[PDB]
Amino acid sequence: NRHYYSITINYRKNELEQKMLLNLHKKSWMEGLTLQDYSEHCKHNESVVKEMLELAK
Amino acid sequence: AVQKVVVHPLVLLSVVDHFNRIGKVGNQKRVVGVLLGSWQKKVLDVSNSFAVPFDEDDKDDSVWFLDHDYLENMYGMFKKVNARERIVGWYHTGPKLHKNDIAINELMKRYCPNSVLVIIDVKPKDLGLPTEAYISVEEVHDDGTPTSKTFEHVTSEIGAEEAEEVGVEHLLRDIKDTTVGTLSQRITNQVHGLKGLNSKLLDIRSYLEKVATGKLPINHQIIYQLQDVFNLLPDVSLQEFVKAFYLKTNDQMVVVYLASLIRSVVALHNLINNKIANRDAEKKEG
Amino acid sequence: MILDKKFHGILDQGEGVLIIFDEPPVDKTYEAALETIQNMSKVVDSLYNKAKKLT
């Protein structure tokens, strides 16, 4: 602390960056057509998930 | 050649910077930048990039302006500081594909290796994936049309390496992770219908219009295979799938049993404490 | 040998129809039944505790 100190830090965001980055991140957590990998797990419920349900039991 | 590519949000945020430093011009046409990545590995990986001035003409569409010196300087310094990344291709922010783009890409087709083209939107009103990776190759046409540059769609994914995830998550503090549960899943199960709705509505209308009302033989032949895919499901009566529905509903019954039993187990402590704690508190109250 | 259950099958006399079938989800109904039976003891014991704390 002797002969030394610091300064506060804040950010700034507008609507463009907000909407763009939010949509891009949501899409990053989503699929291209979004209907692709859903039905996959839906049909994997009778194969994969079942074993996980057995282990859960 | 390349099955899939990896596009980091940093370049699109650099496009956000392109929409930032504009400073109210009154022109705001398409801007061609230079994308950088690693062409060594089979899968393409985007790290960072820079920006080069690009201008066109109002009337004549054949006008395109690039810079060799600025490109060699920027890529030179970038290669000087980081040797783990080289040139790959370019991208534009234009929503529409211009005919001059083949001549624009021809330069990097000569000087550099084969370049990948990326098309995005100036206004992020598109719910779908903003980034479309288009490889530039020469394919033999079935109709017999002269050989020309053809853009083929390549699947892509939006992801980050290590720190970028942290930076995004910190700068947002809004979006949520996968978080397996009720709300996270049901939100998808709700909005996905709209995700297909707006897209299909935006597509099949212009499709239906341009098919009958239009010209410039873009090789409709693939659309017969489209309609064929639409005909791959000739209204199945589910009669064969009845057993599958029975198994699925049986699994549903399993879920019912599990839920009821587990909740019955949880109810123990509650329906004990609600009595034993209240009666003791009441008797020791006075 | 069918009574010994070394394989899956059943005989016939008049018709002479041979039918072969199997039941893969063995571990499901067993663990489910075990869960039910075990939880029954929990609920019953709970009823005993409540009957003890009340009457």
**DSSP states of B196-232:** HHHHHHHHHHHHHHHHHS--S---THHHHHHHHHHTS
Q: Among all chains, which residue has been given the structure tokens 């010994």? A: C4
> Cα B55 to chain center, whole Å?
27
What residues in C contact A54, CB-CB < 8 Å? 27-28, 31
* Gap from B40 CA to chain A (nearest CA, Å): 25
DSSP 3-state of A43: helix
Residue A3 touches partner B, C-beta closer than 8 Å: no
For A39, nearest residue in chain B (alpha carbons):
B189
Environment class of residue B19 by beta-carbon count within 10 Å: exposed (0-12), middle (13-18) or buried (19+)?
Answer: middle
- Say which residues have a Cβ less than 8 Å from residue C21's Cβ, sequence separation at least 6: C8
Q: Among all chains, which residue has been given the structure tokens 């506060």? A: A8
Q: How far apart are CA A48 and CA B163, in angstroms?
A: 32
Angstrom CA distances, B38 to B68, B78, B85, B154, C13, stand at: 21, 13, 5, 16, 74
CB neighbour burial string for C18-50, b if at least 16 within 10 angstroms, e if fewer: eeeeeeeeeebeeebeebeeebeeeeeebeeee
Q: Which amino acid is at B170?
A: H
Q: How far apart are CA A9 and CA B9, in angstroms?
A: 24
Residue C50 has which token pair?
Answer: 């409540």
DSSP 3-state of B257: helix
Q: Among all chains, which residue has been given the structure tokens 């057995």? A: A54
A40 — alpha (psi -120 to 50), left (phi > 0) or beta? alpha
What are chain C's partners, defined as 3 or more CB pairs within 8 angstroms? Answer: A, B
Is B153 in contact with B126 (CB distance < 8 Å)?
no
Q: Which amino acid is at B158?
A: I
DSSP 3-state of B45: strand
| Contact check, Cβ <8 Å, C32/B257 | yes
CB-CB: which of B254, B264, B268 is closest to C32?
B254
- Say which residues have a Cβ less than 8 Å from residue B106's Cβ, sequence separation at least 6: B149
CB neighbour burial string for B168-198, b if at least 16 within 10 angstroms, e if fewer: beeeeeeeeeeeeeeeeeeeeeeebeebeee
| Contact check, Cβ <8 Å, B158/A24 | yes
Is B51 in contact with B74 (CB distance < 8 Å)?
no
Angstrom CA distances, B258 to B263, B283, B285, C39, stand at: 8, 38, 40, 11
* Gap from C28 CA to chain A (nearest CA, Å): 7
Could you say which DSSP state residue B145 is in? P
> Cα B22 to chain center, whole Å?
25
Q: Of B134, B132, B139, B130, which is closest to residue B151 (Cα–Cα)?
A: B134
Q: How far apart are CA B19 and CA B39, in angstroms?
A: 28
Q: How far apart are CA B120 and CA B156, in angstroms?
A: 13
Residue B172 has which token pair?
Answer: 């947002």
CB-CB: which of A19, A32, A46 is closest to B248?
A46
Q: Of B69, B77, B27, B29, which is closest to residue B52 (Cα–Cα)?
A: B69
Residue B256 has which token pair?
Answer: 């019912």
| Contact check, Cβ <8 Å, C50/B261 | no
